Design a protein around this ligand. Structure first.
Ligand SMILES: *[C@@H]1O[C@H](CO)[C@@H](O)[C@H](O)[C@H]1NC(C)=O
Ligand SMILES: *[C@@H]1O[C@H](CO)[C@@H](O)[C@H](O)[C@H]1NC(C)=O
Ligand SMILES: *[C@@H]1O[C@H](CO)[C@@H](O)[C@H](O)[C@H]1NC(C)=O
Lengths: 480, 480, 480
């Protein structure tokens, strides 16, 4: 349940209410370390089958370290940020001398530790893979300085399992130029990520939201490769901070609104263009025009403020009265009376124009409604699909309450003779100004062409003097 | 097969013909189940290596079922659908009481069966993995209860292969929020997909088309995670239904058409904006403006009707007569005099404007044609690359038949003084309408200048009498 | 690497300079091969644990081979190319009789060989996996004709590792319809790709650039599945050729520029539309509007000319005098008085409008500057974050040298009463022509209102002669 939808016949637009916000407002970065036992390329040449599997698996280990070494060497009008600017900024700190040793010394006896860097930022540091101890204690002593021996075959399988994670990380960074998203299992496992969330400087509400939407947290996180230095692989994990949680959100759907009475392509159209996600935020409204950068899990909407606009609350007035005087509502105009459909949360908006067939069908009953020329709406209660032309759209089967708000389509208030049908992105006031301006020039020019009757024309230019008499020019010499 | 291409010099456009349709018109959903053995939260914990490897593999099995458990908790005037709405509606029914048991009982004796759900929808279900059997029969008995013996090392290797597909399925769903596309081979293998196509309620032509294009079917398919209930993982696979097959298709290529005789930046430009794929469909024409949403295999075109517009058959007149009165062909206008090229199916359109070098080369003979200012066309016969400015274009090496259709460029019909060169998405009639209102804006000024000529200004005010002589006021006393 | 940046207050734009070019000019095609040991179902029925593992792994081998067989059978005005046209043409030649044998013979004695195809092109050829020798010499002897025995368990692990690369190649090709990008390490490992780079027909400077930026090469390369015939799997790897290196490059950032003097939506807005990358190339300027099609690695900028426009050197005049007469600078107009921010290389542009709170902060001192209404700029020296409304932007901490160039906002030169705020993609000269047509209609109408106020009305019609005196008609007979 939980969802309600309002359809406005007057503006061919629908609003779905009942969603809860989870907006990413900031970032939080932690450094992930992997201890290494580097070089020791002195191969002992005992050609036993188990020894060459360990050695050829040791090469994969050497290649993984070298690969990572070579690495450290209304959609418009929005803002343009840098998503990994915060995470790249801490990779710059790890390049300084002694900083790697600072975190290496703090992780001497524990897997997790907070390290204060020279930049004045205390960063969480932890270690996920300990290949240094397994190689130098369970493999190399049996191999390097004890006459080249591998006793059991399980040590081969055990070594390729502990090495597998290092190979996948190098493999994932190599095909993403050192920056990966989403944060994969190999970069950070589920238990590790749950542990990191539990230790972040965030609220209990933020910890609870992240721990129950880990898969969404991954899609909004980055992994940034920093340095391979002093037998340590360090990469930064950039986690999202949801500073705005549990505020109401609603999505606006729009569809073309045209006249159905003019002849052929003489019909005019208008469409609201401010579609996307809206959420209350700090007395204002955040607008997310690109619906693709928002993830919806049940009634919870995960959006990024980097792809948002701050708007005043008066923007909601466009839903109920598009001609309001507190906010100028954005629209676009055209003459293309083409049919289309928009699938909403719990219904469908259908714009039927021309000879196009537009219907709404049911899996057990068949076609249950044939739309007439105009912009109509239907909910998912009883309907399962909608057809417009040769396009079959399935309808979301989420249960909710739909409200049909009747009203006169606003396109009928405009005269097609003076209607600017070439506005890609205008507004109500701009359309009114363009009509006021053109009708003023027509009115003013006609008032001048009629106000030039009764004025005297030029007299003959023949070197003679002329006086005025009976509406004509007469020679002055005639009167003397 | 035999692809032909006609280049229309009059509109700087080309139409590639000879293609056959394969239009996705609907969806087919099926339920995929994986039988699980219930989690033994803490099995034996020995120090034997083979038991250790088995123990670590059981943990990965447990982590995969937990990660899936926490998971169930001209294209701007197109319609907006919900491509996954049909599959998600099936996931809803599976959450209901006993619906998972209804399929679990229907799949005890067969790897596949049709199940009638409470929603009245009969869906095809099938069992895809054999893990509950391999564990409880060959691995768990010699390890559960009060035992801890892993006999052969082959059971360690065999369990890794059995369990690998499950880890990979859980791995994809975790980094995709439970909705993946394309349909990977872990979600459905090649032999399982061929088996599901052979059992779909479709004709033999449709089964044959899907079978020889399994790669494309995956590109237009989805995998949707539903539930983890009663020791079985159920997810839905959403398969495409190609209801329109073997109808002719053609592709339209367009390029800027500018004058070359005007001076500096006074040249006017025009461009057809209806690029994309067209296919006959139920007495109408389906238009796909986003070429990236279509896939081409030999002479077959796989498009999705969701990203299409349903147009009348009269839209074809825009290739033979762009000024026809039956259909208003879409164009855009501009002033920019810049060069570009359009790689077509068996040739290349070149728009050379300004002081830019435009070239057609052969890899063995070098430059073989230097284009002049204007819009020209060249086929791939003896041509390997095209060069426009600083960009090198490779041409397609598909053999075909190219027909050059001579004709006057329609940009020469327009007077530059009244040409509206700022239309982002207009049409032929909309430009003529703006030309009409611009000419009326000129003849209005010509009707006021012809109505003021000959009128006389006021004579000097100085207490003297003035007559009219030679277009000037002369004192009356001068003639006394 | 000295990176500098100038902020142009007049146009609300910044230009970051100091980068070096690496432009993808052409393509290079190489053929990668897998030697197969096709193909036997003759599986002897000895049910040994080690033999059954080889049976299952042999079936996976057979499945991958069969799975690959079914595979063989401002940016809206840019040009349209075929990105893999050159790679597909090489696949075409590999279908010809004997072409695969030519490659297979060239690879009998070496893993890398140059082969001359029948179309004249000499192509590097790489054999990356030799499963034919391993199966027929190490595995099949003791099975096919030696009474069905698997001796050691190391041949089970060794064959699984060798077959692993073939499986991943088939899986990656199966979910990408035989065309993949970026180039994964399964299709080409780091050393194999390096081996191909340094044997290409390119200079040493191009070899060094690609060799030290292997991860970028993968992001700009394609793998194309060609053929599976004569026990060989062949796919073409299409690699970039960087024909233009080390030339200067600069990026342009633009932000909306609005008046702040009017009330509510009475203000007008202007924005430069030519944001993106620019580089010098052969005496012109290559422009890359889609910033996502360029990759930056420290000082270097890797762009693709296919997504570029070749512009004259006069385009730089838009940065110094946007009202120049040589090059017409493109802009867009609106009435949207909305706030946003653009993060640049070493700073941040802030467009603050309305009642929005705009702020630049430091991690140690908090807010250090509060922007006022208008378009302002701040550098990363001392600034870590910028807040515009409810959005937080982290700034890039790259050390550089920023220059603030004071200048009058060009949005102030326009009269809002005649300003066309409905231009999605116009230019300085195009909007001056629309203003010129409205101002000439206002200039002429006022030149007539004052001209009719000085015209003389008709004299009395009473058969008497009149002369003009003191602005009145008086009788000529009075002066007799
Ligand atoms: C222009 O708008 C004003 C303000 O409402 C109105 O008084 C006037 O009549 C309008 N002019 C025309 C020609 O519509
Ligand atoms: C332009 O005017 C002519 C003559 O007045 C008329 O025949 C034609 O239909 C008009 N075109 C448009 C698009 O209004
Ligand atoms: C506008 O008109 C003036 C003269 O009335 C002319 O000098 C100017 O060049 C015109 N503007 C443009 C952009 O042509």
């Amino acid at each position: 349940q939980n969802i309600t939808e309002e359809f406005y016949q007057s503006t061919c637009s629908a609003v779905s209410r009942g969603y809860l916000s989870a907006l990413r407002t900031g970032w939080y970065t932690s450094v992930v370390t992997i201890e290494l036992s580097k070089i020791q390329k002195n191969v002992c040449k005992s050609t036993d089958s188990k020894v060459k599997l360990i050695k050829q698996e040791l090469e994969r280990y050497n290649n993984a370290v070298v690969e990572l070494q070579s690495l450290m060497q209304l959609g418009f009008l929005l803002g343009i940020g840098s998503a990994v600017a915060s995470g790249v900024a801490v990779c710059k700190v790890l390049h300084l001398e002694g900083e790697v040793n600072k975190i290496k010394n703090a992780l001497l006896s524990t897997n997790k530790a907070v390290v204060s860097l020279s930049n004045g930022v205390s960063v969480l540091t932890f270690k996920v893979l300990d290949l240094k101890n397994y190689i130098d204690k369970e493999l190399l002593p049996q191999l390097n300085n004890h006459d080249c021996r591998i006793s059991n075959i399980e040590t081969v399988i055990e070594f390729q399992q502990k090495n597998n994670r290092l190979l996948e990380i190098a493999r994932e960074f190599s095909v993403n130029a050192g920056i990966t998203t989403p944060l994969s299992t190999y970069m950070l496992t589920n238990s590790e990520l749950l542990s990191l969330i539990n230790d972040m400087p965030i609220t209990n509400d933020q910890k609870k939201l992240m721990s129950s939407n880990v898969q969404i947290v991954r899609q909004q996180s980055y992994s940034i490769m920093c340095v391979v230095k002093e037998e340590v692989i360090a990469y930064v994990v950039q986690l999202p901070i949801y500073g705005v949680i549990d505020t109401p959100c609603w999505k606006l759907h729009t569809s073309p609104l045209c006249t159905t009475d003019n002849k052929e392509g003489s019909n005019i159209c208008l469409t609201r263009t401010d579609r996307g996600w809206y959420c209350d935020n700090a007395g204002s409204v955040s607008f997310f025009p690109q619906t693709e950068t928002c993830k919806v899990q049940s009634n919870r909407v995960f959006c990024d403020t980097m792809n948002s606009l701050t708007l005043p609350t008066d923007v909601n007035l466009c839903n109920t009265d598009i001609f309001n005087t507190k906010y100028d509502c954005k629209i676009m105009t055209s003459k293309t009376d083409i049919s289309s459909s928009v699938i909403t949360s719990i219904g469908a908006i259908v714009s039927c124009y021309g000879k196009t067939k537009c219907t709404a069908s049911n899996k057990n009953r068949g076609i249950i409604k044939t739309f007439s020329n105009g912009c109509d709406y239907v909910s998912n209660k009883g309907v399962d699909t909608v057809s417009v032309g040769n396009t079959l759209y399935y309808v979301n089967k989420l249960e909710g309450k739909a409200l049909y708000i009747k009203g006169e389509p606003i396109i009928n208030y405009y005269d097609p003779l003076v209607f600017p049908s070439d506005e890609f992105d205008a507004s109500i006031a701009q359309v009114n100004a363009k009509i006021n301006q053109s009708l003023a020039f027509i009115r003013r020019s006609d008032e001048l062409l009629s106000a030039i009757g009764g004025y005297i024309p030029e007299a003959p230019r023949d070197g003679q003097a002329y006086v005025r008499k009976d509406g004509e020019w007469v020679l002055l010499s005639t009167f003397l």
